[PDB]
Design a protein around this ligand. Structure first.
Ligand SMILES: [Mg+2]
Ligand SMILES: [Mg+2]
Lengths: 426, 432
């Protein structure tokens, strides 16, 4: 009987600040077993430097809950495993289901799913999409959701899609999943660099681009005008304010960019302000509003949808309670007819989130041409299964797992502080 | 130059689960703990700041780690510079991009920031030789407003809207200060109501409390409806019809069930039902409130920040709210919340208990009475009779009322001996 023998945590930090000034980092989690040498679950929480140590401590504090557990028991009931962590009332106090403690639980949960897909020798998106509607529904926590999504409503959705799974899988495997780029929209970029990168993005096949705004309206008006012209009237152009504005200012601001045909304004205000996003959306119609990369859990997503605060949402592989929670968010969006545009970038976020969007297309919505996954070309060289883009689209992962395992030489080089690079640097 | 020379932290926890004190529907065996922090400066050793984060056992070590990670931001700062601008000090921590990523303004990292901010206010209070409530209540309306973060609030509470509140109350500050020191502040107790206690114990404690002068008691509910009906009926009979009785479900229910459940308890004359559902479900609370009317609804002990309180008030989701001294971004954030409540006319019943939350929160409610609302007879501060012996300035209850603190500070300082005794895991008591 194979069991989990250890939950090792690694404080990995990349000096990306030498290339605000975020130093991309990751609280690297590994679920070790005594089975086939190749059996281990990998996961990670994306941090930006300061605090990766506290995030690591949080993950390491979960060891007691996992060491000694039978692997088959875990893999057989991922729902019960996630709930063993989420239901610890004492750990709930540090949240509940938000912040550092929840993200730590999410990474351990993610590693468990990674482990499950590995054992079944399937890429996560396939592992997920090939579970029965009953197996899928049993992994989600319906507490606090019965007013918007019942177990039965979840089952009907998964059952209707059941018949088309084979066709969707073939479609994805040959066509790939759409991607959008944010590479051209950095605020520090000159107008010429903006148009130049915008043009290159289109040439590479991307059909949607996103620019940052929020610092200076005059600047935003000028950059949006230039981007539109450089891109043409057929490419989608979204904007990201990164939580900068209050409600009134956001409305005044966005009304001045509407003319450039905005795909959507992302995070106009605080990620906790459900009613504010609704207010902004109403004040700038028909400019679509989105949020989600920092949304704490499925309950807040529920309210965003209930209040009609969003036109579309982002989901993040590492911000919530792992796969289990994202499935509930995905079912929620599907039920309310709201598109999902996964957030990525950071450290391995693309590698992780691609699977959730792909499982979603096959087993939940069957729609992908109306949306896209974010893509950023960073740190991919540190992963065994790096994402692959082909003319603006993600190629479906083939290797088994969640695509989270990083090259051991990478961990040996950037582990902090014992890492080779950090030992010499300081 | 007086400087902050160190930020020391301690993982302290008490075996409160041995008697099931604090026992409730969501937390069956809490071990009251504290992520204790001390802001050390050079010079008058009597000059340091104290604060803590209340935890209930497991995870208190990571909460402690969270606070220790803030040393870098505070050690080396000029004491005078900190105390002279609490608004800037708070923003230095709150506005840090890498710290915000772990939240922002929620969870472990935020409570860690809130403890350091609270310790800074304690420091400021000491330096001025004033207990925190008077320190706060005596700041000018201008000085007060400059301590809060109005970001994400302009649609509910603008800076000038806040000044109007604080200025109309400045004239009567002296009188109310008198009323407070003479009469004390209304309290209510939760000690008789922990789940886990037998019916016989519930009735004995409920009666003792009334005998002790408490005009309000609170019972934990939420695990089993039959139990709740039975316990509420008995507690009501033990208390008599003139004593208020509130109920606390500790987030256990979904909206639909909460409505069905509470309407069955309504007959026992419920003062308010606290946290019927998830602390993030603003819409859910309003839904529950509309369905169980006229039974009052409250929430707040786990509300992450002022932005969520703003929405609770805008959505008419509560009849009254709790504030907690250690849940948010310290005094600065609590002041904003108190101002929001006053502008929306919703009473505040502070959450207390755990470890030293009574010691801490009493100051906020008292400054509120004096400098903001001028209202205290319509509300009360929670009181639990546990662990007060480990504080140098323990709360003092006089016939169901909190007596105004007199010593300078936030009342957070703990006996060095208590620390040495219950520090985890290498503490003396924890060596068995
Ligand atoms: Mg974004
Ligand atoms: Mg409570």
């Amino acid at each position: 009987m194979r069991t989990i023998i250890a939950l090792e945590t690694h404080d990995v930090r990349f000096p990306t600040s030498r290339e605000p000034d975020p130093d991309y980092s990751a609280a690297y989690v590994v679920l070790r077993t005594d089975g086939a040498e190749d059996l281990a679950g990998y996961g990670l929480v994306f941090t930006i430097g300061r605090g990766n140590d506290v995030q690591t401590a949080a993950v390491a504090a979960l060891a007691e809950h996992v060491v000694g557990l039978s692997v088959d028991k875990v893999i057989a009931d991922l729902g019960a495993f996630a709930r063993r962590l989420t239901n610890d009332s004492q750990l709930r106090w540090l949240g509940p289901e938000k912040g550092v403690m929840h993200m730590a639980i999410g990474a351990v949960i993610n590693a468990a799913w990674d482990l499950a897909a590995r054992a079944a020798n399937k890429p996560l998106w396939r592992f997920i999409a090939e579970l029965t509607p009953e197996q899928l529904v049993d992994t989600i926590d319906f507490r606090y959701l019965s007013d918007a999504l019942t177990r039965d409503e979840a089952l009907a959705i998964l059952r209707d899609a059941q018949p088309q799974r084979a066709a969707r899988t073939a479609t994805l495997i040959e066509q790939g999943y759409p991607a959008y780029t944010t590479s051209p929209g950095w605020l520090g970029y000159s107008d010429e660099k903006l148009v130049r990168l915008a043009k290159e993005a289109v040439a590479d096949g991307f059909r949607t681009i996103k620019l940052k705004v929020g610092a200076n309206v005059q600047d935003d008006i000028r950059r949006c005008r230039l981007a539109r012209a450089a891109i043409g009237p057929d490419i989608a152009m979204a904007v990201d304010a990164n939580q900068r504005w209050d409600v009134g200012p956001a409305i005044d601001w966005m009304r001045q960019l509407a003319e450039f045909d905005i795909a959507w304004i992302e995070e106009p205000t605080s990620p906790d302000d459900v009613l504010g996003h609704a207010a902004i959306r109403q004040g700038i119609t028909p400019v679509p509003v989105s949020t989600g990369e920092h949304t704490q859990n499925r309950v807040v997503f529920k309210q965003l949808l209930q209040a009609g605060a969003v036109d579309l949402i982002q989901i993040d592989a590492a911000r919530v309670g792992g796969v289990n929670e994202n499935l509930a968010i995905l079912l929620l969006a599907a039920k309310f007819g709201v598109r999902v545009f996964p957030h990525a970038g950071g450290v391995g976020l693309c590698e992780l989130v691609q699977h959730l969007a792909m499982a979603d297309f096959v087993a939940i919505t069957g729609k992908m041409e109306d949306r896209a996954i974010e893509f950023v070309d960073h740190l991919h060289q540190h992963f065994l299964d790096p994402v692959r883009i082909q003319h603006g689209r993600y190629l479906a992962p083939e290797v088994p797992g969640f695509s989270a395992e990083m090259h051991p030489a990478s961990i040996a080089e950037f582990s902090y502080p014992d890492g080779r690079f950090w030992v010499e640097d300081l």
